[PDB]
């Protein structure tokens, strides 16, 4: 059986595009509002991406397979990862701290990230939004 | 129902249900078939009950192939008479069927349908039956 | 309830053997069977 | 005395009667169930076609309501002499009329939702 295949091929390209992957937990509200943080965070991020919400334990074995070195401060959990490798991001996360932070019982959480290429912390990133 | 239109002889001897099938044993037309696991005289009314149940199940659609044909006369003496006085009158007609005979065969329907239809029909038969698809039945040469 | 071919009727229906013999039970009680 | 609401009704064009579902859901609203028949002013233009609506109440016992666009199967029936066919542009015209609703904000995508609704009513798309 396949030990990391056509799903790595898409994640280790769409996330081997640049060096600013930002990681989040996003599954926990009605998809009306979910398919409108993802169609809405196109108003702050480029190409055609808000998140790739794909398999941790395949997001894990790609950030290592493609040299990009551990996002392993939060690589566990329900990991959605707002890929800003194909994006126009810096304060695009600044415009991602309202619509699912101050909206729900905490709808979209930060977790781990890459600033240019060296690794951005959790609260030193979360607070970086304001 | 189903019975010869003409005949040289009106009554025939009972004979035997022997091995084999002789022929009739690979599919040939449809995608699925119903094969006989035991010998038996299959009556015209059995074949018909079967065929009809077959069509109820695919209400419009599909084709049914009836590969057996009852051309053997079933005799039975009048009720409560004795032995002798000659051979009984024909009560009906049977098709002789030995193990491995493909009896029915359907096509033009889903697997779900043919399975289900052939199961029903085979419930109308006096014998154990198996259903089949199309393997080594490419029995051209 | 009591007959010779005991089959599952619905999806929730559950074949069980017990006290010797084969039962069925769906959540819907009409489907409750026993061989006999 | 009733509490708050975000009512998601679904009323057609013209016949606006306080009859349910404009009764059980809008009895906790104090809703002007006749300040809708506001509607046939904006849809005195159109004429037909259902118009979705969301009526929200507050504390002082006042109401509100914003409406979406008419069924995707509507504009397609008139654009074919139906109760026919539409070109690769006449599909790209309609996907504009409902682009602030569907989900996509494209037309290579949006049009296909319309082109899909083509075989939903048996109406070929002129190529």
């Amino acid at each position: 059986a396949a030990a990391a295949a056509a799903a790595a091929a898409a994640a280790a390209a769409a996330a081997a595009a640049a060096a600013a992957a930002a990681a989040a937990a996003a599954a926990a509200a009605a998809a009306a509002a979910a398919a409108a943080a993802a169609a809405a965070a196109a108003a702050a991020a480029a190409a055609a991406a808000a998140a790739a919400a794909a398999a941790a334990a395949a997001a894990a074995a790609a950030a290592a397979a493609a040299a990009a070195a551990a996002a392993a401060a939060a690589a566990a959990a329900a990991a959605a990862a707002a890929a800003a490798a194909a994006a126009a991001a810096a304060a695009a996360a600044a415009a991602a701290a309202a619509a699912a932070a101050a909206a729900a019982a905490a709808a979209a959480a930060a977790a781990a990230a890459a600033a240019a290429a060296a690794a951005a912390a959790a609260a030193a990133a979360a607070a970086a939004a304001a | 129902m189903l019975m010869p239109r003409r005949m040289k002889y009106r009554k025939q001897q009972r004979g035997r249900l022997k091995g084999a099938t002789k022929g009739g044993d690979y599919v040939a037309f449809g995608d699925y078939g119903l094969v006989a696991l035991e010998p038996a005289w299959i009556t015209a009314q059995q074949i018909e009950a079967a065929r009809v149940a077959m069509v109820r199940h695919f209400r419009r659609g599909g084709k049914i192939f009836i590969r057996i044909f009852p051309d053997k006369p079933y005799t039975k003496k009048p009720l409560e008479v004795r032995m002798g006085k000659g051979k009984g009158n024909v009560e009906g007609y049977v098709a002789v069927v030995k193990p491995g005979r493909v009896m029915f065969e359907v096509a033009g329907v889903t697997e779900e349908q043919a399975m289900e239809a052939l199961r029903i029909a085979g419930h109308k038969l006096p014998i154990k039956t198996k259903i089949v698809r199309r393997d080594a039945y490419d029995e051209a040469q | 309830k009591v007959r010779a071919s005991v089959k599952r009727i619905c999806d929730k229906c559950k074949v069980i053997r017990r006290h010797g013999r084969v039962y069925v039970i769906c959540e819907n009680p009409k489907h409750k069977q026993r061989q006999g | 005395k009733k509490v708050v609401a975000v009512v998601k009704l679904q009323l057609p064009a013209g016949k606006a009667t306080p009859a349910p579902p404009v009764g059980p859901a809008l009895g906790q609203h104090g809703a002007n169930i006749m300040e809708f028949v506001a509607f046939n002013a904006a849809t005195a233009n159109m004429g037909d076609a259902i118009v979705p609506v969301e009526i929200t109440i507050y504390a002082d016992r006042s109401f509100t309501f914003v409406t979406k666009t008419p069924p995707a199967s509507y504009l397609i029936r008139k654009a074919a002499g139906l109760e026919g066919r539409i070109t690769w542009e006449q599909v790209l015209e309609i996907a504009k009329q409902k682009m602030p609703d569907l989900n996509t904000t494209d037309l290579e995508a949006a049009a296909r939702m319309i082109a899909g609704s083509a075989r939903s009513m048996g109406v070929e798309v002129v190529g």
Binding site: - | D25, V55, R56, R60, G61, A136, D138, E139, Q141 | - | -
Partner: protein
């Protein structure tokens, strides 16, 4: 398609079958040798291969021969093979059975009704350099009566049919509303060919 095959001397075809081995034979104008194969390995291959595609026979020595199956003899009771005749190919226009691929939706199935694939093979003369797979067949014209056949089929180069043609290869045919006229019918009265004087 490969298939480990072996050589049979002169000992009782019952045993092999009993073992697990489908007894058989390869032959052609030149050759003729008794051989068995694994029944279980032979079934895996012959289900995809059928008589249509070439099966290669790897003997003990390493000699891989391409072969077509000419004949598989069944058991009747148990739809089960008893024997294979392997035809060993050479430099030859050989006669063989090539799949038709009925591709298209016939306009007479869309109109209710059924495609009866009379023939799923046609018998062709052809040299083993060019064994086609499919011979795909234009179907989509056929309305719920008419029935294309013979050579109304595109034949790739050097391929040429050793049938008639005329031999019918496909009909589309009519498919519960007629079970009343059927049940009613209850007619005829079986007639005995008059023997006798006259």
């Amino acid at each position: 398609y490969r298939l480990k095959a072996y050589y049979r001397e002169g000992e009782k075809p019952s045993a092999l079958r009993r073992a697990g081995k489908l007894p058989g034979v390869m032959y052609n104008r030149h050759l003729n040798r008794k051989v068995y194969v694994d029944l279980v390995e032979f079934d895996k291959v012959f289900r995809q291969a059928s008589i249509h595609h070439v099966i290669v026979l790897e003997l003990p020595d390493g000699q891989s021969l391409p072969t077509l199956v000419r004949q598989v003899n069944l058991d009747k009771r148990r739809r089960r093979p008893e024997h294979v005749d392997f035809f060993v190919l050479s430099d030859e226009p050989v006669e063989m059975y090539v799949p038709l691929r009925f591709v298209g939706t016939p306009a007479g199935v869309r109109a209710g009704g059924v495609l009866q694939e009379i023939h799923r093979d046609i018998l062709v003369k052809v040299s083993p350099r060019n064994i086609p797979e499919f011979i795909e067949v234009d179907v989509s014209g056929l309305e719920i009566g008419d029935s294309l056949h013979a050579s109304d089929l595109k034949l790739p180069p050097g391929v040429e049919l050793a049938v008639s043609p005329e031999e019918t290869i496909a009909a589309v045919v009519p498919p519960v509303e007629k079970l009343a006229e059927e049940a009613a019918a209850e007619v005829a009265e079986p007639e005995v060919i008059k023997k006798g004087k006259e």
